[PDB]
Scaffold this motif. Structure first.
Motif, PDB file in Angstrom:
ATOM      1  N   UNK A   1       7.691 -14.993   6.125  1.00 54.97           N
ATOM      2  CA  UNK A   1       7.564 -15.692   4.854  1.00 54.97           C
ATOM      3  C   UNK A   1       7.399 -17.178   5.118  1.00 54.97           C
ATOM      4  N   UNK A   2       8.296 -17.742   5.929  1.00 53.23           N
ATOM      5  CA  UNK A   2       8.221 -19.133   6.320  1.00 53.23           C
ATOM      6  C   UNK A   2       8.053 -20.060   5.138  1.00 53.23           C
ATOM      7  N   UNK A   3       8.909 -19.902   4.126  1.00 58.46           N
ATOM      8  CA  UNK A   3       8.864 -20.791   2.968  1.00 58.46           C
ATOM      9  C   UNK A   3       8.844 -22.255   3.394  1.00 58.46           C
TER      10      UNK A   3
ATOM     11  N   UNK B   1      17.319 -13.934  -2.722  1.00 55.66           N
ATOM     12  CA  UNK B   1      15.988 -14.240  -2.204  1.00 55.66           C
ATOM     13  C   UNK B   1      15.664 -13.406  -0.973  1.00 55.66           C
ATOM     14  N   UNK B   2      16.545 -13.430   0.032  1.00 57.11           N
ATOM     15  CA  UNK B   2      16.248 -12.774   1.305  1.00 57.11           C
ATOM     16  C   UNK B   2      16.119 -11.274   1.119  1.00 57.11           C
ATOM     17  N   UNK B   3      17.012 -10.679   0.329  1.00 50.51           N
ATOM     18  CA  UNK B   3      16.925  -9.243   0.105  1.00 50.51           C
ATOM     19  C   UNK B   3      15.693  -8.901  -0.719  1.00 50.51           C
ATOM     20  N   UNK B   4      15.395  -9.708  -1.739  1.00 49.75           N
ATOM     21  CA  UNK B   4      14.195  -9.474  -2.533  1.00 49.75           C
ATOM     22  C   UNK B   4      12.926  -9.908  -1.810  1.00 49.75           C
ATOM     23  N   UNK B   5      12.992 -10.966  -0.996  1.00 53.22           N
ATOM     24  CA  UNK B   5      11.820 -11.359  -0.217  1.00 53.22           C
ATOM     25  C   UNK B   5      11.523 -10.323   0.858  1.00 53.22           C
TER      26      UNK B   5
ATOM     27  N   UNK C   1       7.019 -15.080  -1.464  1.00 52.00           N
ATOM     28  CA  UNK C   1       8.035 -14.515  -0.586  1.00 52.00           C
ATOM     29  C   UNK C   1       7.674 -13.106  -0.128  1.00 52.00           C
ATOM     30  N   UNK C   2       7.000 -12.326  -0.977  1.00 53.53           N
ATOM     31  CA  UNK C   2       6.625 -10.970  -0.585  1.00 53.53           C
ATOM     32  C   UNK C   2       5.320 -10.961   0.205  1.00 53.53           C
ATOM     33  N   UNK C   3       4.349 -11.786  -0.182  1.00 49.02           N
ATOM     34  CA  UNK C   3       3.083 -11.836   0.536  1.00 49.02           C
ATOM     35  C   UNK C   3       3.180 -12.646   1.814  1.00 49.02           C
ATOM     36  N   UNK C   4       4.394 -13.068   2.177  1.00 46.77           N
ATOM     37  CA  UNK C   4       4.674 -13.870   3.361  1.00 46.77           C
ATOM     38  C   UNK C   4       3.823 -15.132   3.397  1.00 46.77           C
TER      39      UNK C   4
END
Ligand SMILES: [Ca+2]
Ligand SMILES: [Ca+2]
Ligand SMILES: [Ca+2]
Ligand SMILES: [Ca+2]
Ligand SMILES: [Ca+2]
Ligand SMILES: [Ca+2]
Ligand SMILES: [Ca+2]
Ligand SMILES: [Ca+2]
Ligand SMILES: [Ca+2]
Ligand SMILES: [Ca+2]
Ligand SMILES: [Ca+2]
Ligand SMILES: [Ca+2]
Ligand SMILES: [Ca+2]
Ligand SMILES: [Ca+2]
Ligand SMILES: [Ca+2]
Lengths: 312, 318, 314, 313, 162
Positions: free
Chosen positions: A36-38, B55-59, B35-38
């Motif tokens: 993801x690398x936000x 976020x992390x669990x949903x991402x 977050x999902x499409x990286x």
């Protein structure tokens, strides 16, 4: 175990090597590993820019390990957990051992029931799903694979394998697990119907014996074969139903002739069931006991009438 | 069904970003898609540790769902091909041709049907590679099962061509066709001479028996092969002579005119080898054959002298 | 093998010569009748020196003869074939060799009713059908040259080749061209992709029926007369036959243009083409000068065939 | 077995009383009535015998048919026992071939004129073998009882090419369990198991794909390498490749090959010289000829004869 | 295949091998084709198809077998000269234009004595003479087939120049 490796390497390298909280350092690991690398924690010092490449690799291995193993486990576990909390499951399931044309045509009448097919050939998998059942790859003669279909605590097991020996071998394996679960089995040779029953087959259907006898009877006139095939399709409006005589029946002790069921409800009484044995065309002086099973042909409307005519 | 489950992780992330970090319905959707499409543009990081969990669990769970969409998208890349295929089946007034079976014959047939809408239906998957480089569309299916004939849009096709491995299977296919479009033109190859009639009984309109043709050419090619040289050379477009079917329109200058009175070879240079009255052909017609309307003239000639027959034959002006 | 036959013969002619007292002429006819159970009667045991010698010689002689009779017939099934195989001394274009047994070579054979033809195939069970179709059978691998010689390809009219694969077909042709390098070779091709290879191997004429069939299919979509023609001329059901006619030296047509010859007008025979050696010209132009030896390809009634055959001579 | 005697004694009784013959005359009749010889020395003299004539025709026919099949089978195993008796005398010089491949076929074509036995598990080969000139023995060359059926013991040598290298190895072991000294030559399908073949008792090992692949590679640039091997091995060329032995007490024992100038003196090319179980290719100039050394050379049959004389005392 | 140095063809059957060879010659009718022959019966058929060189390894083997009964040095020779594990390599050496040997008899040249290379044969184009007679005159461009150590080959290559 691979998810723990990148987690341990990443949540510490952001807590100490760049100065983030315990909550901020782990939040760095979860986006960099999933690619993801936000960006909320990037290398602010080359001491982090060095570990970034190693963590990008170490995190990619954990991301691949988390994606492939967990998502496959997240699709099958979601079927068992969502089924338990959202809505209920009516009754126990059915196991079908072997994938033949018979067991295929059987599945067409179990549309809407929980069914599991167990067959050793893999490519059969696709056809089974588009038929409405669940598939399990395994040899229904190996006991360790019968256990994989939850035979124990199944409603019944239907067994048609390639050969009569394999069918038998399967049946014995079942009875080595759930010695009471109902076993229905197809018989390719007449010569070994009895051998199938010895193995624990509760009911045995031998479709080639039926066919040959229908053939012979179809020379003169084909109504015999026409009868059998049409009563069994729901395309015919006449359905063949088993109706039970409730306890404290209006008919208990009433002779079948005294009852005039054919006249009263229009259901033809082709036979009457006393447990595991059946009397076809009962004599006029057959007294209805409670709990007897009525085998009859009729329209869905006139069956409902018999079901009322039979109560207290 | 299982793919239908994939949509859930995006909404749970759109839910795990709407309240656990305080975002609008418009903000929750923009967060999950990165977050999902990286992509991870970065506009929403955990400002409270309650968001880093959601976020992390949903991402992560949503990132797995985002990758799953590609398989549905690959299916969606086949539906966009369906929107381009609809534009091609209405190109001219001829509809498509279905080829049941992949033999060497139907390969050679497909190679001369370049320029018509053609669909090959074969149960062998590896056949797909050759079919595409041969210029037709492939359909994986058993040409005996009717639900797979239907997968080739046999109804309302120009014609169906049938060469299956055995003559028995061919028949079954024909019967399957005739249970759908009892009028569509069916051309069928016959592997044994012994069952031509059986092919026609099933509803085959024309039947080609390449072993009967070949066996007979050999017998006639012993002495000199000009017979066999003839058949093969008339059929390759490399020869300047083309073999064409010419129809006699209603109200022709020839309606009622004898074939001798027409002097067609002299007038047009087209050789008249036969004239067709329906489903049968008269070869070297008798001198006194009266041309009726709708008869078909079978002849060989140069493209210029074909043009000559086509006008000398046409109907009178109103 | 033959040592057991000499044993009963020599022991019986001697055991009647000394153990029963007979000449060489009486003992051998005694052994030949006692061993062969003929029992013509000229020598039965008149003394137990013979009645013992009869049973032992007749039993050993009946048993040795029974093993020997089949061995003689086994040599008589191959040697009588070897005297008939020795009989093919013709040095002429008499016979036709067909290499391979396919449906084509069957349909070909059914049109050669009245000719002596030989089928060469590696599969034995084929023998029953080949005989019932009217040809002689030869069990052998048509790629092995010693088996081509078993069909006397050398000095044959022509050889026809349809094998299971194109590779095997080629291999056979090359073998033929190693025996009689001039015999006409007709060969069927399963793939278009290797017609040229078949001709390279020495096939003079090559027929590829899937290309024929495929092309006829393509042409039968709209209307099928194209396909109807090819199949109909080749069945004798139509009164029209398709014949190749040669132009002799000293013709009424020699040097005459076909338009000045007006063959379609003169004889009613349709002239679809004219043959010049190993090439054919279809629908010749009106201004084609007939040279000597040209082959005219035409369709016509059996009556008008004679007319063109007359119109072309001196 | 015992059933054949029943009809014979049964006939000797119907002629002993019902036709007036002795036990010796009745017994001689039954043996001729069964073989349908009908020589004639005893015809039915009474209708009790003419009845017995019709009845014995069935009983006498059954004994004759059963005895020939069992005796011919006993004569086919005795012919197998008599054919086994002929290979034992030829055995100090016979050659056994285990397996029928293209290799073993072209070897056999160069052994025209020797006592050879082919042992193969597939029967239909028998016709091919006989039209190639050898005796056939049907058997699995891994089973020893079938090696014994080819008298592998005390053979000149045994040559082994089986379907796979595993079967080839297994066979060699079976041989060495009979004649641990007989010469065993075996082809190896893979180079990977040459040593394994030699471990099992293969005396000489030929790997034709290694020969082939290498000739192929050397045939790209120029093909003379492949041309050399194949031509020296055909007997049609005048140059033959012969092994010439150096006798004990030779004009060359202790004489250097350089002092010998054999190509100069005799015209035979010396490509190598053999000392026992090894061969030295292009031997060095200072090689001392010991007794029993083997000379490997190419030359015309005339110049071979010169080498054979130039080498003696 | 077109613009290849050479093509080596060993397919499952001799027919398929042939069928391949003909296909090659339908593309590059001059490229060198080397082909393996499973049956002796059709070496000639392979050459007809355009096989430039034909190696039939089973024919070699069988003949080596027969010659290995008495003594196995024959098979020992062939297999060892072809492995580079043997120090003797078998090399083809060309006679340069304007050679020191052009016109020199092979006996006059005493090559075996001079360079230690054994002359097993001499190549004149597409044909080979094994054990040349003493009176064979070296022409230029002839190919020498010989066995020797890598050191003594370099000597012959110098002994052969102008
Ligand atoms: Ca079944
Ligand atoms: Ca009936
Ligand atoms: Ca009713
Ligand atoms: Ca076909
Ligand atoms: Ca002809
Ligand atoms: Ca024209
Ligand atoms: Ca064919
Ligand atoms: Ca058409
Ligand atoms: Ca006419
Ligand atoms: Ca082998
Ligand atoms: Ca080279
Ligand atoms: Ca010499
Ligand atoms: Ca090979
Ligand atoms: Ca030797
Ligand atoms: Ca040296």
């Amino acid at each position: 175990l691979l998810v723990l490796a990148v987690i341990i390497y990443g949540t510490a390298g952001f807590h100490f090597i760049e100065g983030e909280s315990w909550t901020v350092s782990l939040y760095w690991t979860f986006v960099t590993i999933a690619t993801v690398g936000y960006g909320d924690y990037s290398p602010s010092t080359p001491l982090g820019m060095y570990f970034t490449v190693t963590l990008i690799v170490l995190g990619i291995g954990t991301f691949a390990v988390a994606v492939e193993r967990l998502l496959e486990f997240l699709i099958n576990r979601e079927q068992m957990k969502l089924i338990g909390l959202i809505d209920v499951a009516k009754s126990r399931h059915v196991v079908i051992c072997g994938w033949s044309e018979s067991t295929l045509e059987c599945l067409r009448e179990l549309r809407g029931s929980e069914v599991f097919v167990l067959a050793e050939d893999e490519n059969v998998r696709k056809k089974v799903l588009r038929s409405g059942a669940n598939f399990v790859h395994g040899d229904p003669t190996r006991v360790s694979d019968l256990e994989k279909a939850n035979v124990r605590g199944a409603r019944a097991v239907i067994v048609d394998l390639e050969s009569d020996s394999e069918t038998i071998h399967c049946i014995l394996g079942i009875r080595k697990i759930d010695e009471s679960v109902r076993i229905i089995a197809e018989a390719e040779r007449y010569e070994n119907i009895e051998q199938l029953r010895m193995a624990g087959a509760d009911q045995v259907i031998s479709p080639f014996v039926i066919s040959g006898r229908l053939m012979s009877r179809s020379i003169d006139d084909g109504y015999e074969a026409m009868f059998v095939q049409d009563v069994l399709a729901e395309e015919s409006t006449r359905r063949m139903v088993e109706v039970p005589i409730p306890e404290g029946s209006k008919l208990e002790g009433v002779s079948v002739l005294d009852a005039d069921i054919h006249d009263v409800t229009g259901v033809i009484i082709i036979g009457v069931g006393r447990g595991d044995e059946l009397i076809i065309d009962p004599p006029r002086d057959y007294s209805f006991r409670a709990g007897d099973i009525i085998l009859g042909i009729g329209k869905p409307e006139e069956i409902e009438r018999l079901k009322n005519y039979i109560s207290a």
